[PDB]
Amino acid sequence: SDCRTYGFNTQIVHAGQQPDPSTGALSTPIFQTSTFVFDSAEQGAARFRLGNPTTDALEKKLAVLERGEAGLATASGISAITTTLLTLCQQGDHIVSASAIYGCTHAFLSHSMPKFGINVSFVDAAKPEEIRAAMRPETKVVYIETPANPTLSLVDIETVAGIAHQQGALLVVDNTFMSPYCQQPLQLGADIVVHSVTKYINGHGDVIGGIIVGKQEFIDQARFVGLKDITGGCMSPFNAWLTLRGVKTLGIRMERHCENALKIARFLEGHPSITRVYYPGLSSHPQYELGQRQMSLPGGIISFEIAGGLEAGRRMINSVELCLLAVSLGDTETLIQHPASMTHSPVAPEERLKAGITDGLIRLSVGLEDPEDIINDLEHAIRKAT
Amino acid sequence: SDCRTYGFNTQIVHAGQQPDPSTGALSTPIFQTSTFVFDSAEQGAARFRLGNPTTDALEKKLAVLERGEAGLATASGISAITTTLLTLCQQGDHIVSASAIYGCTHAFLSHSMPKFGINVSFVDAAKPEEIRAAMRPETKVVYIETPANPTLSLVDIETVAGIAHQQGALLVVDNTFMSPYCQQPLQLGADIVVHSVTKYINGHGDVIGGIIVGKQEFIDQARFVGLKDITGGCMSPFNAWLTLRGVKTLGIRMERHCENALKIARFLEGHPSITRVYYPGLSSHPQYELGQRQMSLPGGIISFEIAGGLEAGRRMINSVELCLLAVSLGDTETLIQHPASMTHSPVAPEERLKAGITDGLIRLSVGLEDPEDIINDLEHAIRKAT
Amino acid sequence: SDCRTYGFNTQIVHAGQQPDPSTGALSTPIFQTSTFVFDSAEQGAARFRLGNPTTDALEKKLAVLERGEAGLATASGISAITTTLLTLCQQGDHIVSASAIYGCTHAFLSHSMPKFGINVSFVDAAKPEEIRAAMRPETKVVYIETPANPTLSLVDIETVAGIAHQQGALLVVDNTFMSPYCQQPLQLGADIVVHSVTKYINGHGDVIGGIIVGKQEFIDQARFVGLKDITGGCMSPFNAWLTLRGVKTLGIRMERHCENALKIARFLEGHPSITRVYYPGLSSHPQYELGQRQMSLPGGIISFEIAGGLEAGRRMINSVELCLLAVSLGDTETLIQHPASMTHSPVAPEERLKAGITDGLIRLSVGLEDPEDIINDLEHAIRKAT
Amino acid sequence: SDCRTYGFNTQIVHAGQQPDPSTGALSTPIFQTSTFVFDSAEQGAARFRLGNPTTDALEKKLAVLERGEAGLATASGISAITTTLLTLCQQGDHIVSASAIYGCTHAFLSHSMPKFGINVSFVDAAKPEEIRAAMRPETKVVYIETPANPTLSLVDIETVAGIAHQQGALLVVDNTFMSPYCQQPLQLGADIVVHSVTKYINGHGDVIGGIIVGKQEFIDQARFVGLKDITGGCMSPFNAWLTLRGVKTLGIRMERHCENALKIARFLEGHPSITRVYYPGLSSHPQYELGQRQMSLPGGIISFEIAGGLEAGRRMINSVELCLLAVSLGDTETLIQHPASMTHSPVAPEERLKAGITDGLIRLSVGLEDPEDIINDLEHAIRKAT
Numbered sequence A, B, C, D: 001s002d003c004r005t006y007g008f009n010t011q012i013v014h015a016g017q018q019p020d021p022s023t024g025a026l027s028t029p030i031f032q033t034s035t036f037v038f039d040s041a042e043q044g045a046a047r048f049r050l051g052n053p054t055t056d057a058l059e060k061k062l063a064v065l066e067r068g069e070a071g072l073a074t075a076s077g078i079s080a081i082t083t084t085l086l087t088l089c090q091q092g093d094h095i096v097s098a099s100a101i102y103g104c105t106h107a108f109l110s111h112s113m114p115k116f117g118i119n120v121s122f123v124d125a126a127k128p129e130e131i132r133a134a135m136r137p138e139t140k141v142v143y144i145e146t147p148a149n150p151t152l153s154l155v156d157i158e159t160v161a162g163i164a165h166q167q168g169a170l171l172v173v174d175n176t177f178m179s180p181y182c183q184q185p186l187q188l189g190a191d192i193v194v195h196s197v198t199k200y201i202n203g204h205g206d207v208i209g210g211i212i213v214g215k216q217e218f219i220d221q222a223r224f225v226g227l228k229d230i231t232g233g234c235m236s237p238f239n240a241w242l243t244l245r246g247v248k249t250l251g252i253r254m255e256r257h258c259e260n261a262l263k264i265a266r267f268l269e270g271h272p273s274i275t276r277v278y279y280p281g282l283s284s285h286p287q288y289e290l291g292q293r294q295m296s297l298p299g300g301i302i303s304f305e306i307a308g309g310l311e312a313g314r315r316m317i318n319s320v321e322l323c324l325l326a327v328s329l330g331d332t333e334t335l336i337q338h339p340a341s342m343t344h345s346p347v348a349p350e351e352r353l354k355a356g357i358t359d360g361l362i363r364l365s366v367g368l369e370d371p372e373d374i375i376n377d378l379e380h381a382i383r384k385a386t
Ligand SMILES: *Cc1c(COP(=O)(O)O)cnc(C)c1O
Pocket: A076, A077, A078, A079, A102, A104, A105, A145, A174, A176, A177, A195, A196, A197, A198, A199, A208, A209, A210, A329, B049, B232
């Protein structure tokens, strides 16, 4: 009847989707079209490119899963973020943003927005008082991400939402790392959720895309102004269909990701060659109790520091046999990276250190393989490297 | 050897493409991936999401066809335009734009850009002196489209390029209506060409996408700043593969589109119920000789005015049996629309008139059907309507 | 190193796949091509349409999962079956087949094979002595399916394999209902396994296809004679890529299917309006202990009989709100059907009864929804119907 | 109104297709589904896997283009041929077949059919009297292909149809080489047309598939018995959608293929290093006048013999720079092959000679490139080789 009444796994499978009325086709048809035709001049005037039946199913599903009114699919995670913020802000406006944010978001906030006259203050969002202190009469948006790279620190969504709203601003939360299966920011008072569906929501490492979920009034503006008149970042219907297909298994995937990650995190925490393990599922995590209230599962991502700094981390990732060396996350395969030797290699060491990137830090996206195989591969590479 | 030496039809088929080195596959493989993997930490540091082998083939092909250095594919035609202009301009900059431009472009220029502190002057670009008179010390870009809706007026690309360059600005040309088969703005001095590949370049009515062609130095900025840090408007690999597939037949398609359109335009010009016909292939076109120098073919689009104004135009499009009522163009099917009753129905009549949209104006995108069938359908509907 | 050494979930994710050597693309590229090109006359002679790199990955993966030497993908489950049997048999040969087999297989065996001079004896394969008694000097193949429609009866694979081999025949097992995650017939002595990947292996209700797994020597004949010279039933590369994508989640899907099915089967067995429940996970199943040895999980399919015969079964399936009425199985959505009112409606009642299809029999393909929601939907419809 | 009344180019674009009634989508949606759902038990019984709305559009289009009642899409050209003949024939039946037939067809007819008790007589179908002399009381089918490899000899369809029908047999014509744009065997009295759509009908070198066109009564048997109960050779919906997309340009493609081929054939006929040129468009072709009556265009394929036999042919194909070495045909790229050094290299020379394959024979599939570029490439390689 109404998918919003059913359990979350049922919603994952069914919400936004129904057998095709005209054919009975169970799969959502791929409306790979650019042209829609009218039956008459009158129907043409009535209807008056920005929508599509396949993409509509994905948007409605994600709106159900995040408990939001409406969804809007985009060409990429970054396009979800910029379509949102460029819809909301204009010259002279202000944004308060977490500092521990995903890389590409940072360049948009630190360079692109100020060149359009939109100023951004960066703060440590694990300290809600820093958010409050940075707000200005011009502040339209508080922007946060939780958990946050590179040490999986957290932000208290409900507390920050209350602060933002008291001072008249919207709260936008990037929920990519968690997916709606593990965290629901709108239920905690956020106004707008954005995702890179490139990660867990699609989950199969073969789609670049984004989604925005929020109130119908905002989503209509993000669609008819943000996409239409600013970014042009529409998602293709085939990408929407693949994401619909991937998200069918979101519940069973996240359960296995997190079950595997907890096993691996406990193994790493017991290993004498590993100095630190960052994982919200470990009781030693600095914000463990907050994570238990805010997150239904601790997630599939782990960071850890290997003994011996830069050269040990390089030797470790060059010694894995099953884990794949890559910079993405949320795929069915386990992915590993060593930022100080890979992504941030030209960055000055003390500059890396301020960003929380130590020479020995390894980031791991835990996949769906047998956890014993992942652990044996990690142990093999750690033993050789140290 | 080098595709840039071959004839244009040969380039259309082959440029940017080669059998897959590892498999011999003739078709460009669809690299429908989000994740690329490294063989070592060292290879990861060396390579250091924004590129893809399938999309690279499309970009290289269109660069060859427009005689530009480099190409950049995007999520939509509008994203090609906004990624370009938001890469080039910042708060305090100025753009001189033609007034006769495509609708969505107009909203971006008239509302979005000024809200980022980027001012835009709109001029009649058929009068190059109006472009010169509007230029300011702050002008970074002159933006033109030719032919231009809704009466297929022209802009003299070589003359405007000279004006723009003397005053230190770049010339950006939207070449969507023509395709590189019929017009090559970079060869006439433009700096940057943008397309909606949604129209003729894909040609099959099943892809929304854009492309940008220009100097390598600019394209690198449009990719690594514009797409990465502003619009996020990446094209999906499947959309790139479909566009590669569609553009294989660009030469034979444009030849047939234009051969059909000239037959239809001559028929309409002989019909006593049609007051005006706008088509660059007719000697009565106000800028006919300019079109003959600048365009290799007169294009596949026709506008015409039917006797009897609004109600005759409505009755005519409600009487076609083969032409399809739609607002897009460049498809293999003939498409027809009556703006005053369809798209611009809520717009005040005198406001439509300033935009060149008379009550009886019909726009026709001529397809690949037998021209005798298209003409008989038009004659049938015109006879009934008048 | 070698995927055949890793755990089964690891094999599911990784076997047959590797990052693209030339690009590092993690996803298997979609080699949607018909033409492969040679670098020289000599390379053309050396290579001398029937293979494809995408489909090869799927074939190698399924060979690993079934512990067979080689795999061969096909256009449909039925094409996997007929390509196999038409490769093995010629005029004058004989097949012993189970009677409890899937419908389309039955028409091929009962009408098509005898018209090619290949005789077929149908037996009750739950009684291995009936298989032995039916074998002839001409028998090339024993053909079985387990579990088998419509009451989920079983066939003892290891015992039948021994009988077939002693009498010089091959054993072919249709393993569609189980998938390699739950049953491995080659490990029990079968020679050839066939699947409809349309069901669990793809799992997403959007691919029709088949696969054959067996010895390299047989698979080479099925490919170069069966596909090339008899059925022409090649799988398309896009279908292979979608099946590769679907099978990534086979392990977590089958676990959830079977966990849900056991909950639902126990609910049905406790319901006083349900006269019988057929499910290998219930201790009351006639061959329960055999299933425990032969199957790692009891599967995702349930049959049950509702009180009140034909009209109660019709009223029940017309009263479900979440379960979808369909004749397929193995999808992420729960599917339900009532054969006596749907598929077998024109079949005479006593003829249905011999086929094990009683008037009240309902078949259920349990999906990935919350089991509480499926149970509540079944209870709702059962209460109304009875 | 009715597409069967319109011109052939109009039919190519429109036949079998219409805007989606429920959405107005112009492109045929890709119904990439395996499962169709019923609204009630009653609708399930009424409807009672073998059909699909996307594939139905392709089948209806090709039926219009060949002037047949009905169409049936298949997994491959060979599957179109074997599904047809295995539907029509059973043990004890007879087929008269041309000897000059495509390779894979030959293995099916010469080895597979006799092993099912279906005998085949091979004759020179350019001599209709040999067809008559081979007919038997048991003959169900006469099977021909025209033009035929490797020298592009012809078969008189109308004359052979009359012979077959007088003796009570059906005529099946493989029309792959021509496409319906250039030859219409049903209009000349054939009963059934088969195609590999892998060649010209799709035309883009990225689909393997087949089609069958004939009377509704036969097509129903080919679908519900041949596909369902014998070959299982269904076409996937995505392959059908790609073929629908490719065939949109069939008319303009065949015109350009044939215009280019005639230019190239005349060039080759003037070249003193080329001993023979086989092309139906040359007046020296042995059956030229028959081709003029039976074919609307002479086709896009050329065979020719280069001076100097085996080593000259090898050196020539190793010296082309634009033509691609491949064994397929009908693609947008020009393809070339030298059978005696490539495909038939292990075949004994005198055995090749009986098959019409001389040591110097080159086969050329003329593409859509500029003909001057193709001619210059051929001249370059011919000059070097001789
Ligand atoms: C990957 C990621 C993004 C960027 O998404 P794209 O689809 O790659 O543009 C943004 N935020 C987070 C937290 C991410 O992990």
